[PDB]
Amino acid sequence: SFSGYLKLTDNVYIKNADIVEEAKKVKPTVVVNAANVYLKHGGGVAGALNKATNNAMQVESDDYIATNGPLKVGGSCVLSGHNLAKHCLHVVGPNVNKGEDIQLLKSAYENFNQHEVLLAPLLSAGIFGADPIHSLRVCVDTVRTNVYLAVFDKNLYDKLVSSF
């Protein structure tokens, strides 16, 4: 049901699209959220996915944190996808703006290997402060399952394809 993606490798595909709109259209088995360790979905991809769920993602996430405590940087948890997907895989890439180790980006993408197919954003990109060209390279060199990357910014999308 994914359509219009450009094939980068055997298993990695990419499209200039809003991941919220893509999830509403496709209703994938798994949508990846660019989460923080507290599952506080304020802004970026997380704020946008949460708003699309009418804040149900944040209510579920606060119950998960109250029970389990925070995730690790490089870690993940599987929660409901609400109206966007069957499941949401909340993955914590390092936030370089907040001082986290960029080597944890490969650990973050390893979480995707537990799922056969995913709709995802580039981890640690945008407000997380990392170089998106580097994030795409770690993605293609780490993930073995089928990943459909949605890149919101048109100019970044064009740069990512032309420099790949």
Ligand SMILES: O=C(O)C[C@@H](NC(=O)c1ccc2[nH]ccc2n1)c1ccc(Br)cc1
């Ligand atoms: O373009 C990408 O997908 C990376 C992107 N991410 C966001 O910050 C980002 C933020 C909010 C969003 N809502 C749905 C999606 C989404 N994404 C980013 C945007 C612009 C620049 Br300039 C650099 C990076």
